[PDB]
Structure formats: C-alpha cells, structure tokens
Amino acid sequence: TRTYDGDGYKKRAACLCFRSESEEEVLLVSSSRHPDRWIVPGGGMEPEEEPSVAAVREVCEEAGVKGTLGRLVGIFENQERKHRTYVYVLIVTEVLEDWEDSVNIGRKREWFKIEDAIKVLQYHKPVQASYFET
Numbered sequence: 001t002r003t004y005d006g007d008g009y010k011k012r013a014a015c016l017c018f019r020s021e022s023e024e025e026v027l028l029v030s031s032s033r034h035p036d037r038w039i040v041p042g043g044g045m046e047p048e049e050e051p052s053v054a055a056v057r058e059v060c061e062e063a064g065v066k067g068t069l070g071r072l073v074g075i076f077e078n079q080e081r082k083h084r085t086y087v088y089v090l091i092v093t094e095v096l097e098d099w100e101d102s103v104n105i106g107r108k109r110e111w112f113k114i115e116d117a118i119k120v121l122q123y124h125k126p127v128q129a130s131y132f133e134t
C-alpha cells in the first residue's frame with residue numbers, strides 16, 4: 001500500500017548504506033526498470049510506518065543488508081516523479097546472501113566510493129546524487 005503526503009507526493013524512505021563509520025563507500029543496487037543502472041535502495045513507507053523503520057526495511061528487502069541506523073540526512077523531493085524521500089545513514093554490519101530482491105528479480109548490489117556513486121546516479125537519479133552533497 002503506497003502512502004502519500006497531503007500534497008499527493010508518495011512517501012518514501014532510503015538509506016545511504018556505508019561500508020563503515022568512515023562513510024567512504026556506499027552500497028547501490030541495480031534499477032528494477034533498467035538493471036544496467038544504479039540507484040540508492042529505498043521505497044514506499046507503509047501506513048503509519050515510521051520513516052526510519054521504512055528506510056531500514058526497504059534496504060533489507062532491496063540490498064540484503066542490515067546495520068546501525070545513523071542520522072537523518074534530510075528529506076528530498078522529486079518534483080518530476082512526485083515523491084518525497086527521507087534519507088538516513090545506515091552503517092552496514094550484516095551482508096546477507098539471498099535477500100528478497102536477489103531471489104525475486106535478480107537485483108544486484110555493489111560498493112561505490114562516494115565520488116563514483118555520485119557519478120553513476122547523476123544521469124537518471126540526480127536527486128539521489130544530491131543525497132551525497134553534504
């Protein structure tokens with residue numbers, strides 16, 4: 001069940017899944033629409049779902065990882081696609097082998113140095129590139 005802010009924007013949450021507290025490498029996942037493209041794992045908040053709970057859930061589902069939830073980076077709107085995404089930092093402590101999207105749609109995951117994550121998101125996901133700006 002998709003959920004929405006009062007202005008009709010889809011509510012979403014995502015994590016910047018860092019390899020360590022140094023925040024030098026981040027985990028991206030393959031796009032479901034176009035698997036040759038990278039995205040920040042994330043998705044829809046469920047009804048009455050806390051943003052930080054949605055964020056942690058979606059990354060488990062999409063990236064097959066778990067860890068220590070960190071700070072909220074900010075809230076990011078995609079005017080074109082009408083969504084508003086809460087973005088949190090998650091320091092990965094568990095990397096799991098056969099996660100929901102690997103099983104169901106063969107979703108891929110890869111570590112990127114931050115500067116490279118920004119590069120591969122720029123073309124199709126400029127708002128997700130902006131998650132890294134601060």
Ligand SMILES: O=P(O)(O)O[C@@H]1[C@@H](OP(=O)(O)OP(=O)(O)O)[C@H](OP(=O)(O)O)[C@@H](OP(=O)(O)O)[C@@H](O)[C@H]1OP(=O)(O)O
Pocket residue numbers: 002010012030031032033034039042043044045058081083
């Ligand atoms: O399939 P996902 O989870 O990776 O993400 C998809 C969105 O799913 P999202 O990550 O928001 O939700 P969830 O399915 O909960 O992860 C979906 O959003 P939706 O509109 O709800 O179908 C969106 O559609 P858009 O809003 O029309 O841009 C795109 O299909 C997007 O595909 P991707 O970025 O190419 O992987």
Ligand SMILES: [Cl-]
Pocket residue numbers: 018019020021022023024025026
């Ligand atoms: Cl790191």
Ligand SMILES: [F-]
Pocket residue numbers: 042043044058061
């Ligand atoms: F999802």
Ligand SMILES: [Mg+2]
Pocket residue numbers: 042043044058061062
């Ligand atoms: Mg999802």
Ligand SMILES: [Mg+2]
Pocket residue numbers: 041042043044058062
């Ligand atoms: Mg998603």
Ligand SMILES: [Mg+2]
Pocket residue numbers: 043044058
């Ligand atoms: Mg979902």
